[model samples]
Target: SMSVKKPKRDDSKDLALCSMILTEMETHEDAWPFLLPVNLKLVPGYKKVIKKPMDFSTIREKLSSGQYPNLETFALDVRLVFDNCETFNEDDSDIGRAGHNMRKYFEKKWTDTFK
Candidate 1:
């Protein structure tokens, strides 16, 4: 038997929305183990500035309301947050564990649920 659902693809819509969600998570000091739409768990410290948020509000104004924006930029932004994670040994730090999971989640979740 074959599944009815469309096969998952790396899509701009999924990438952009996930990036926005992850970007929002970065602002909160207590945002670890973030709740879905995207769960950005672990990573060193809070508000540990790296690539910075995309001013999603500003971008929203440019586009139609509730619509996510460009794929490449959003995908890059999400990866950038992970890129800036503080160094942690996978065996030692909970943050490290979460970080690993977070990446795996990103690869799968972003494309799995939406679109």
Candidate 2:
């Protein structure tokens, strides 16, 4: 009998998610408040994705046969802070409004691009 398995996500979602979170913090200072209200905030959703198991042996077979479609989506999160610097900036001050404007534009653009 042959073994059948579900197609695995090659990327280490946990590592990728953690790395991205750290990168955002390193780059953005006042991102807390803005991020707190965003639609993307879901702790359990992220945890479930990352905690999924990976089988390296299966991956090696795919690589050796050159028969895998390991498609990866590259999402851009370009940040520019100084422009959003408000006069009454708080301790968790964000880049001025312009930075957000840019991000909004980028989000729409990315969504459209994918379509």
Candidate 3:
């Protein structure tokens, strides 16, 4: 299918935690390596998390309707996670966070039910 259903937006909520939902959804089996929507870009190492049927079309629907502006925050978190993970399994403060909140201007989002 193209997208899942979602309710209206509430402009007052923080999306930092909610971004975890997007990450978790992407980590699911459905939207992995080859199935990623154009709006989302994941690292190669993270692609290995795709193992079960999962997708975030519903999340995209929420985003399109202005239900949330946390996508950029979500992307920043994701990028940081990847940047921190590309080494010999070590976590440090070397990760950068410049222009991290720019993901909010995104007008595009998508969803796919893993098959």
Q: Top model by TM-score, which number?
A: 1
**Model 3, residue 7: C-alpha shift (Å):** 24
> Model 1 reaches what TM-score against the true structure?
0.41
Tens digit per residue, CA lDDT, model 3, 30-68: 233212332225345434543231124545455546665
> lDDT rank, highest first?
1, 3, 2
lDDT tens digits by residue: candidate 2, 3-110: 977886556453444334334443454443333211225433433333322122322333345444332212321222222223223334343454454456545644
Task: Please give the distance, in angstroms, between residue 23's alpha carbon in candidate 1 and its true position after superposition.
Answer: 10
TM-score versus the correct structure, for each prediction = 0.41, 0.25, 0.24
Show model 3 residue runs off by greater than 4 Å: 1-69, 90-115
Q: Candidate 1, residues 1-115: lDDT per residue as tens digits? A: 3667777566656545654655544444433633322212543343343334333233334344444455555556455445544332343466556656666666575566453
The order by descending TM-score is 1, 2, 3
Q: Which ten residues in a row have the lowest lDDT in candidate 3?
A: 98-107
Candidate 1 Cα outliers beyond 4 Å, as residue runs: 1-69, 86-91, 113-115
Better of 2 and 3 by TM-score: 2
Q: Pick the candidate with the highest lDDT.
A: 1
